[PDB]
Design a protein around this ligand. Structure first.
Ligand SMILES: [Mg+2]
Ligand SMILES: [Mg+2]
Ligand SMILES: [Mg+2]
Ligand SMILES: [Mg+2]
Ligand SMILES: [Mg+2]
Lengths: 57, 118, 233, 51
RNA sequence: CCCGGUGAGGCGGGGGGGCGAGCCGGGCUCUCGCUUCUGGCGCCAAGCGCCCGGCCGGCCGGGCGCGACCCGCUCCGGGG
RNA sequence: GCGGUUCCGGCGGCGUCCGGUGAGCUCUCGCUGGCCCUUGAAAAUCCGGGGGAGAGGGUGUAAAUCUCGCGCCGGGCCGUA
RNA sequence: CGCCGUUCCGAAGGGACGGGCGAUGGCCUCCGUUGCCCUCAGCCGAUCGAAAGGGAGUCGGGUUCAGAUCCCCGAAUCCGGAGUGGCGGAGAUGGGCGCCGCGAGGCGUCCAGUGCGGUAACGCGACCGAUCCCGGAGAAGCCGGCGGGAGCCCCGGGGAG
């Protein structure tokens, strides 16, 4: 609809029942969840190696 | 104590309200658009007669400065009637014509008799 | 006893990482033009060469002397507008039925007194502006042999005379019970000002580079001295 | 009016919670979704900004 | 006096800490200031220390400091 | 086909039905492509999301709250042949 | 007289969730309003500029000598307001334990409750939330081909004149 018609529509008609729903596509919400999780794991992996290397040093 | 922003802005200072020693105008100006000024005279043409009989509508010539709200209140107080709505136009001769419709419980034909239109 | 849910959550403020805290930016603020002007004027007076006639006013009494001098001068303050009325009314009653010593204020009044040798001690504000109003007075007092001193604040001399400001004041006479106090001040003030007048008037001011410049010069020279020390080792 | 393309690059603001959009001259070989790095200690890679 | 940048946001000096060197554990030569895998996220403080208020040691709620080093005379550079 | 003052939104009966077709013309919606050393506005305005400072009641006479369904009031000024 | 200049040599914010001190009132219960202080705050450029650009929402019938998407009839719709802004519905109304009862259920306590469905795309009538942040829409040329829907035209029959 035209942008000023959205004002008189209920919320249900303007989004989707999902995180970021109505603003980001489903496909790229799945990617961000994996990317956020997978990247945060690598930080723990890299942090552990740094701690171990310092421990040896 | 410290500035967390690199920008200096003019600090807000007190602004007093006016307290005039004298009023610049001795007395307030009188209202020059009272009810008698707003309604000039009624229109009595063939079209105006049709409006009275068929549309429950009085036709008036009114001050060009008057708006529909002012026209409505003047008509109510001048003739003690009730107004449903008001339509206005400005004529090619510069006068403003008001199409005042009365509430369904008032008969424009009866009202026009009181005013002297008919 | 500590709740296991609580925990430390430190912020890392390295480049990248977390948004920087709200630290004090005072040094880097963009100030209004009038603030920049008066600060840049303070820096110029340090950066340039200040002639001795203007630089002599940076030499001022210490607080201990300036407190004794101001307590003595407090006993001879001019009568306020209010209490002149009472003196006048009292004279009216007395008439129906001698001038005590007082401070002399104003660069025009003090100047005439110094030239006439009628002044005993001259107190000069250090921050008169335009400075030409008094820039000549220290040299005049020295010529006439009138002891003079420089005091911090034309507002302090202003408070003495119940006005906003005063460029200079002068003692002409004191009560007998205060003659010793005046003598003690004069001897101290005379040594600092009248007897050093030869070196005061040949002592230029200012001519100091900014801290960053001085540090840069210090770093550059220290390199040579270390190399010179390492020349022989 | 310009022969060269322009790259739209987004940085984080180090002092405020914002995204900064810059408009660079696009060095040949850069692609969307690429990471570019600007500063004294950026690595010598095509598209990075270094002194 | 001029020029450029910026919402004039961390400049100079010192302190503090880390890896190296090397002289007979300490002092110094001297360097560094915590982000490079991915088309995520990232503010509006956690924690700690010290004071204070209200109600019945227990509840409810405030202030300061460290965290976020200190001192400085031009915002930072470039000219001159 | 009937009435009236007959200058009545007058009153009556019946009907307003069933299919086909097209590189047809006009408009429109959509899909897909080509062209550019041409890449083809801005803003008012409206919306969704991320976050979670807060608020709401102590099991009821329920509260904060609701972009849901109804209901209540108003929309002035100028142009208009 | 003025001119240049429109962010450039500028202390360019008169605002706000919230908090604390008071003052006034009223459906005086407690809430409004209001003054100050604290806190928070980029917009960065006054203003003008389009009856063909952007820009919510009105249609059918009748009616005049001359006006009608404006008048009348009928049927709608947008925006704004009302917390004395009213009524429904949602939030919402569950479970454990202990008594009483054959049971339906009823009492007393202790806990939950800022909705729910689908593997998913997403759906359902709502379905709390501020500073702040990200994004969408407004908002995008010209030409070709092809397809869908309409209006019109055409063809075959029923009526009525
Ligand atoms: Mg949320
Ligand atoms: Mg017309
Ligand atoms: Mg305008
Ligand atoms: Mg327009
Ligand atoms: Mg209407």
């Amino acid at each position: 609809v035209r942008p000023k018609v959205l004002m008189r529509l209920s919320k249900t008609k303007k989004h989707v029942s999902r995180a970021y729903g109505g603003s980001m596509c489903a496909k790229c919400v799945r990617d961000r969840i994996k990317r956020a999780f997978l990247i945060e794991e690598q930080k723990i992996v890299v942090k552990v190696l740094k701690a171990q290397a310092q421990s040896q040093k | 104590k410290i500035r967390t922003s690199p920008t200096f802005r003019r600090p807000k200072t007190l602004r007093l309200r006016r307290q005039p020693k004298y009023p610049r105008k001795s007395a307030p100006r009188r209202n020059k658009l009272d009810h008698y000024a707003i309604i000039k005279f009624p229109l009595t043409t063939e079209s105006a007669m049709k409006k009275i009989e068929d549309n429950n509508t009085l036709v008036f010539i009114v001050d060009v400065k008057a708006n529909k709200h002012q026209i409505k209140q003047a008509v109510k107080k001048l003739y003690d009637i009730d107004v449903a709505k008001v339509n206005t136009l400005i004529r090619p001769d510069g006068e403003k014509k008001a199409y005042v419709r009365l509430a369904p419980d008032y008969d424009a034909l009866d009202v026009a008799n009181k005013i002297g239109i008919i | 006893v500590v709740n296991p849910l609580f925990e430390k959550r430190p912020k890392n403020f390295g480049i990248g990482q977390d948004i920087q805290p709200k630290r004090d930016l005072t040094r880097f603020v963009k100030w209004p033009r009038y603030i920049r002007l008066q600060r840049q004027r303070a820096i110029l007076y340090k950066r340039l060469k200040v002639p001795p006639a203007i630089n002599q006013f940076t030499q001022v009494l210490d607080r201990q002397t300036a407190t004794q001098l101001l307590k003595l001068a407090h006993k001879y303050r001019p009568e306020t507008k209010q209490e002149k009325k009472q003196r006048l009314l009292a004279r009216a009653e007395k008439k129906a039925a001698k001038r005590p010593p007082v401070l002399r204020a104003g660069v025009n009044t003090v100047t005439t007194l110094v030239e006439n040798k009628k002044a005993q001690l001259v107190v000069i504000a250090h921050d008169v502006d335009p400075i030409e109003l008094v820039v000549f007075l220290p040299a005049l007092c020295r010529k006439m042999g009138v002891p003079y001193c420089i005091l911090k604040g034309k507002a302090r001399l202003g408070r003495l005379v119940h006005r906003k400001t005063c460029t200079t004041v002068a003692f002409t006479q004191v009560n007998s019970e205060d003659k010793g106090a005046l003598a003690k001040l004069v001897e101290a003030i005379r040594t600092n000002y009248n007897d050093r007048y030869d070196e005061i008037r040949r002592h230029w001011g200012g001519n100091v580079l900014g801290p960053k410049s001085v540090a840069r010069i210090a770093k550059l020279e220290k390199a040579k001295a270390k190399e010179l020390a390492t020349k022989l080792g | 009016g310009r022969g060269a393309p322009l790259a739209k690059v987004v940085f984080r603001d180090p002092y405020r919670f914002k995204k900064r959009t810059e408009l660079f001259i696009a060095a040949e070989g850069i692609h969307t979704g690429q990471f570019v790095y600007c500063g004294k200690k950026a690595q010598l890679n095509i598209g990075n900004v270094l002194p």
